[PDB]
Amino acid sequence: LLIEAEKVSQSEIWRRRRQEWEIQRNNAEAEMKQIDAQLKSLTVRREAA
Amino acid sequence: RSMVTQLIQFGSTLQNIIERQDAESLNALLQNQAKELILTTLSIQDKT
After folding, report:
1. Rounded to an integer, what distance in angstroms lies between the CA atom of residue B11 and that of residue B15?
2. Chain A, chain B: beta-carbon pairs less than 8 Å apart
3. Residue span of the signal peptide, if any (chain B) (predicted)?
């Protein structure tokens, strides 16, 4: 039973690790869309200049 | 002599008229240039 407890605990910390990976991926994609919209702002400023 | 002083009165009047019309033409030119400049500043405000 202790062996089986260690196995299921290792699987659970793998799942929590994967969830943290997914949160990092979503932050990276959000920053990428942010920088594209800021590029649109900058080319508008270029047209004004 | 009376004829000559009459003529010099005409000369003074003509000098004043010439300087006055040059001032007026310069004024109209300044106004048209102001019109073009305000068009450009409108476009810049749109981009803002």
Report:
1. 6
2. 6
3. none
Technique used = cryo-EM
With beta carbons under 8 A apart, name residues in chain A contacting B41: none
For this entry, resolution in Å reads 4.0
Q: Give A35 to chain B, closest Cα distance, Å.
A: 20
- Kindly determine whether residue B44 and residue A44, on different chains, have CB atoms separated by under 8 Å: no
Q: Which two tokens stand for residue B33?
A: 């240039």
Helix (H) or strand (E) holding A24: helix A2-48
Tokens 């270029």 locate to A46
Q: List C-alpha distances in Å: B11 to B3, B6, B7, B19, B20.
A: 13, 9, 6, 13, 14
